[PDB]
Design a protein around this nucleic acid. Structure first.
Lengths: 259, 158, 134
RNA sequence: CGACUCUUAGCGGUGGAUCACUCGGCUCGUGCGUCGAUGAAGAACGCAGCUAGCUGCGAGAAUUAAUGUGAAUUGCAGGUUGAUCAUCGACACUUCGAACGCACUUGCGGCCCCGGGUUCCUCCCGGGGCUACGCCUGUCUGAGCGUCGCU
RNA sequence: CCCAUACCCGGCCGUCGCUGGCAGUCGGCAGAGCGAGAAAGAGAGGGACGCUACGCCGCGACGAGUAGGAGGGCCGCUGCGGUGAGCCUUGAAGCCUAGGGCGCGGGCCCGGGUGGAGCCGCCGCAGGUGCAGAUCUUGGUGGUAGUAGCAAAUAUUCAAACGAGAACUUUGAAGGCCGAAGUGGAGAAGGGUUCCAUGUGAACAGCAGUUGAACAUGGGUCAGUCGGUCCUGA
RNA sequence: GCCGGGCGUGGAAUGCGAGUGCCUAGUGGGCCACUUUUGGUAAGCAGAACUGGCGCUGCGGGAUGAACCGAACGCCGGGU
RNA sequence: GAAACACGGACCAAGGAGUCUAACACGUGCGCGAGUCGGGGGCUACGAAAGCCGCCGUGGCGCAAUGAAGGUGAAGGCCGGCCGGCCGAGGUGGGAUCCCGAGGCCUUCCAGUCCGCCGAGGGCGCACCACCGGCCCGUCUCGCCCGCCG
RNA sequence: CGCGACCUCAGAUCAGACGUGGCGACCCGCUGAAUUUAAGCAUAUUAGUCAGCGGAGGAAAAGAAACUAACCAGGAUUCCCUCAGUAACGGCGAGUGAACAGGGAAGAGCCCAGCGCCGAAUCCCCGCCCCGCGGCGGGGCGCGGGAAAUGUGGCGUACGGAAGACCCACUCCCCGGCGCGGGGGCCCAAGUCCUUCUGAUCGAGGCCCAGCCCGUGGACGGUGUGAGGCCGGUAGCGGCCCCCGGCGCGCCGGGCCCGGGUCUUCCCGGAGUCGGGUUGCUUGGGAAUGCAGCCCAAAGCGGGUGGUAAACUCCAUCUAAGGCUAAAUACCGGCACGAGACCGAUAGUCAACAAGUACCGUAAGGGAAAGUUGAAAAGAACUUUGAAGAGAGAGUUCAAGAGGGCGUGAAACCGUUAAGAGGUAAACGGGUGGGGUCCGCGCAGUCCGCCCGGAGGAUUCAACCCGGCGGCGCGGUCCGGCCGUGCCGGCGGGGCGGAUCCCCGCUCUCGGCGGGGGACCGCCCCCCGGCCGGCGACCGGCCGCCGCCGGGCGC
């Protein structure tokens, strides 16, 4: 709100007496706005309480290792089909989830070629689902240049660009990503993890140098290596019924004793 | 009114600070304007280095820092005298000169004289007019290999 | 998507420029498509509509296969008056109902020196798009 | 059963909340970064066929020329060798205003030159151009028992 | 003999405690158990339900509350990132409701009516986010109340005309008043078209109006001699 | 003061899981009664001690009632 | 101490009051860990985003304290003849957990092993607490000695 | 006296110029408070801030050390990070508060006076000639006028400079004319295709084999709801046409003789200023940081600084009292644009609208309220009652239940209709009862398995056969792949990493330095070989068992 809002008037309380409510009022005159109550958040006109300032802390900073952590967790969830289904991506006919296509697709230069590719990869149904979600927003966002909303589609990750971006930017939902300059705001839209991604072969072979294996640090980051797991065997179903544990267990007391 | 236990804080907010708050929302726009002006300058002086003239090797004062080495403002006049470079020509071939520097030591003097020898050898000088290659100018073939150098020229590695 | 940083996409700015466009810009906004028989004859998609042009209404209550010439182009109201497209008022006089040009297909043009030079230009630059792409 | 009074509902009034709209704001950013004695900013008064405000304009007065555009403008009348819009480089731009002949009543001048008026013979009338303060370079005319020189 | 929200028995809700129990749904690769007062081994040579484990289940005890503290809200508002192959001109938001219900509650879901173009669920994010009060702010409306009131300066009456319409206009007559220090005739200051004519009766003229200083159309101010202009005064 | 060793019928009753550290709001006007008690003729007065109340608290009773007597409260049925 | 002969309030709608910034403290969640952090600067529609840069960690805070300051600046013991070898990072009490095991855990009877379980007692003892020593800096008291370019 | 110089000083409507006023967000110079905080208050603080005054610019100001430092030293200004809430100041209370170094952004340096040399070698103006002539400039010619010796110009400025001599080295730039990417305009893809909703479709369904068509265009807006394909646009290193300067090339008229090194001989600096005293303000600056007034008032191996007053003595460091200078930087005004987790008509600017308007005040000043018919006026012809306002019909439209302050149309309040009730004001809690209102669409009341009974009807069961698929295998250990956040082996191959140890280059053939190998170590990758394990975060073929499905038979 502007710094002058509600203060451009010259008002003054009438003081006690005169049987009014002791709020600053507009000075004299032969108009309606004469002795009406000017300043103060409760008056018509006048300030709002605590005028919002521009020097509010808008931006936030996150630790660089925490940013790199999230991109590792985002990519690692893009390889689990149960997590990509749960994101709503219609991927029930994709041949293999970490979808990798040959580097020929970077040479594409016409949207007609790109849509034909998505049909062959059985990923068109995801884009066909984006069309079905094209509706207008609800609320004041419509009068603020946010009229139409839709669904996120598959994300295409390329290594280098020879026209693939021009060939795909017209398809709704598709977001192009350069493998080097990966973005967490586009790999995990809405904060939820599990966005369906499509890799090119040249981009797929560059991930072991952007993050490295556990026995080999990253070659493209100065000093970075994948985060360590807090537990190796997360399958606690296979753990509990393992013999090593069952021998060390008392008998399950499962007789209910009601009052 | 101080509560149980804390620090005695003295916030310097007793003036009218709110009238003189400088916000940094133009920061990304400034970084763009700077870069565009930096590239526009590099194109204007295209074959010459982008960083500018060479700076000399320089110690730091103030015993906290005298184990390190910086890039000075310019070469001293005696460093140019020993290197055989006229003080009014060195700026025309990209050698920063400042007449204020003195040289108390010989190794600092000798380290910079040795540095100008290494630069004068790496310098590809174009003829004043391509029709008439003059004396100190480079041979015709290496002008074909002369490209702009990025980063600080002959960087100072401590 | 649009990438030109100097072209706005603001809703309020586009509506303001539309409802306050000067006359010579009103002319362009009030363009109509040509009929199929004219579209491959001049190789031109659409054209600003003049005062005496044969016309078919395609949308609305007055749609049909009747041909009618324009009688006036009321540029201030963003609307055109077609000769037989009228309704009865209360006191028995007829009034021209206004039709928006976008909801109108041109079946015959009012050719003249200035009009022809427009058609050829819209056709000249149309071929550039097919000789540069192919 | 009345009348009156109270409660609830339907309908109708009063009133203009809510909701939905938004050619307006607010904030951030970018580029540029330009007033005036060649009369500025501001003010006044005028200007349309029918027009009060707003807007535009200046006695060439909702505009002229020029160029681009290419058939309207429109509330009602009237009337392509370029209508209308836009641009805007030519021209024009009333009275106040730093405001400038002196005053601020629009009141009194002065000078010069033209036209009626003469037949330059003084007037009178009209028209045109001048007539502010400070200051700079230069010019002209001067002042001084200032310093001198020659007769 | 009577009865409290006390005490006893029972139901239900919640909280707390047991830092309780449940991964054993161990099935023709089967064997159906760990309620048992007593440190420790049913040791080898075709079959309901369940277990959002942040879930489900079992026992006990307990429940006042201002100022204040904390937790949980599948309470509510507005916008944003995701998501619902969500809803919607075969009717969205909003509003109305003697309709049907849910929840301890905040609230919510249906039905009906009205309306005419947008809206909501869920996972996160953000806040100018929830009103009965502040002699609160702005707007609107009551009771009072068809009430107080329309009482300073003597005074009106008859007939006619116009007109839809006359206590109030106009004409005539009568009776009165101002009574020349005027309720008369003219100016300065100030007002600024109120002047004049025609027309109208919405509003205004605190009743009325055929009238008006209202409203709508038009009209109207003529100078050598009257002033300004000139002169000087404080 | 140090080592080393031996002694457990856990050495009165009753009851009960304890210890410990951070951060911390509100409050800092009180009032009443039994008993003790100071000033005062006295006061529904002024000032203390001890405990319990009221304040923060409804409920049964005292016709009525901040404080007395009984008794303290989740929502109900029966009993007393 | 309010139903008060205390004050505000006729009625309805809408608006209407613990906010933002900075600093600090403690709690909590996450990443890394004797380190940690690019916030400033560079480099390559949404995007003013994101990514990268350690020969961009300058620098911040932390890793060392103490004194006004000059300054100084964080274990020792034994053996052999002030030197040479060796042992070399305190102790006591209480301590969750772990360890040992005197023994003791059924089908016709004994002998009879492996595993599992239990346990008197005995141990190493985390964190933390109490205490006793030790070390560094300031200061005081009492002394004996050493060292060398002046 | 006269006449003429010159110096001072006047007058001109003299010839030609220039200044004034505005805006003021940012900037520079002054002036300069008090609320407030200190729980009082006077110093302090607020604050060198508001108000006041002056002056600018597209930026301003600052700026090439009379500097910082004490290092092995840095090297104009400005800005950012840090220094640092630090040193310091302070009723040492409240509070206040820099700098250097270091890292970045940017980076650029220069000119006089003086001292001297050159014959004033210099400049302005008038007249003529040529060239261009909307930035009146260039060249030439004038015994044409003036300025200037009371000092113009060239050389030259502390980094030293000059002159001479001696070697060395090129002799080519700058002015005045002519020719050979940015702003505006106009254009550029593809459905109004079939059925069906609607007042109107941009809705719904479809368009097979091309699951319509375009797509470098699926931003947005318009259009009778919701539009990639109707229109404007959007995309494009798309097209075309004007205008502006740019960039060199060539010609002419010009100014244009210029440097470096060694040697010798000469020369060299800014005064009522510095500094001192004192007074007042200011500062973190404390025996006075800065500024100013008054008094005193310099020096020249001097002067200033060296954060405690003073003397002495060494060092270090600059060179004051004259001048110019881009960039990085600031910008709530202006012009022109873009955007938003912002507001959505009591909000957001006071102002979404004939808003700084109406209106108020003598004036300075104060200062509102006020958005929405419908897709389209189709804005209700005509009949009828009335003087008319107003009605009744009719009509328009999807709708008048949208009728000109007209979207939706809440509450208070009011009218009317319907129902109920009525002497302790009303209203309320608990408990029932009665009456209404609607609803249950209650009005002959449950299905679900299995078994039995009798009536029926199929292509029908089990079991075998072929085919396909799946599950599992302790196949006691099948074969083969594949991988390892396992390891070893190496007459291995490489890439790096390492504070592990001959060649080239450089400054004083041998020593020193910098660079490049090479060796070693570590790590990773690869070629293998061998094991270990997994494939239940990850596999294939056989074999067997089992299940399912399909088709045969079976009837």
């Amino acid at each position: 709100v502007s710094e002058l809002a509600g203060h451009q008037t010259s008002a003054e309380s009438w003081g006690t007496g005169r049987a009014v409510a002791r709020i600053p009022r507009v000075r004299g005159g032969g108009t309606h706005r004469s002795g009406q109550g000017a300043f103060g958040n409760m008056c018509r006109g006048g300030r709002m309480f605590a005028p919002t300032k521009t020097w509010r802390r808008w931006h936030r900073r996150v630790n660089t290792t925490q940013k790199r952590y999230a991109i590792c967790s985002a990519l690692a969830a893009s390889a689990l089909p149960a997590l990509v289904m749960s994101k709503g991506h219609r991927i029930e006919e994709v041949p293999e989830l970490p979808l990798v296509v040959e580097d020929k697709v970077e040479g594409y230069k016409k949207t007609k070629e790109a849509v034909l590719l998505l049909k062959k990869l059985k990923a068109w149904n995801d884009i066909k689902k984006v069309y079905a979600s094209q509706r207008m927003r609800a609320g004041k966002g419509k009068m603020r240049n946010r009229r139409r909303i839709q669904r996120r589609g598959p994300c295409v990750i390329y290594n280098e660009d020879n026209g693939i971006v021009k060939a795909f930017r017209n398809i709704p939902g598709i977001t192009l990503l350069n493998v080097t300059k990966l973005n967490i705001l586009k790999l995990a839209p809405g904060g939820h993890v599990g966005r369906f991604c499509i890799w090119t072969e040249s981009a797929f072979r560059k991930l072991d140098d952007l993050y490295g294996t556990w026995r080999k640090a990253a070659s493209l980051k100065s000093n970075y290596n994948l985060p360590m797991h807090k537990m190796l065997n997360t399958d606690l179903s296979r753990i509990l019924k393992s013999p090593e544990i069952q021998r060390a267990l008392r008998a399950p007391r499962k007789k209910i004793h009601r009052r | 009114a101080p509560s149980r236990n804390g620090m005695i804080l003295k916030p310097h907010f007793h003036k009218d600070w709110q009238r003189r708050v400088a916000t940094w929302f133009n920061q990304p726009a400034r970084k763009i304007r700077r870069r565009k002006a930096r590239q526009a300058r590099a194109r204007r002086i295209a074959p010459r280095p982008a960083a500018g003239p060479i700076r000399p090797i320089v110690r730091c004062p103030t015993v906290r820092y005298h184990t390190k080495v910086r890039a000075g403002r310019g070469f001293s006049l005696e460093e140019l005298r020993v290197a055989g470079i006229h003080k009014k020509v060195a700026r025309t071939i990209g050698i920063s000169v400042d007449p204020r520097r003195r040289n108390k030591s010989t190794e600092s003097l000798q380290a910079n004289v040795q540095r100008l020898k290494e630069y004068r050898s790496k310098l590809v000088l174009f003829p004043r007019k391509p029709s008439a290659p003059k004396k100190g100018d480079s041979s015709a073939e290496e002008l074909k290999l002369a490209t702009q150098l990025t980063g600080p020229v002959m960087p100072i590695r401590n | 998507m649009k990438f030109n940083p100097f072209v706005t996409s603001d809703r309020s700015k586009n509506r303001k420029r539309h409802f306050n466009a000067p006359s010579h810009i009103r002319r362009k906004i009030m363009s109509s498509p040509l009929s199929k028989e004219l579209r491959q004859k001049y190789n031109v998609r659409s054209m600003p509509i003049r005062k005496d042009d044969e016309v078919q209404v395609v949308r609305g209550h007055y749609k049909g296969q009747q041909i009618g010439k324009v009688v006036q182009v009321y540029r201030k109201k963003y609307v055109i008056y077609i000769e037989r497209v009228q309704r009865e008022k209360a006191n028995g006089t007829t009034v021209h109902v206004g039709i928006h040009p976008s909801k109108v297909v041109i079946t015959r043009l009012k050719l003249d020196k200035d009009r022809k030079k427009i058609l050829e230009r819209k056709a000249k630059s149309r071929q550039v798009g097919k000789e540069k792409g192919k």
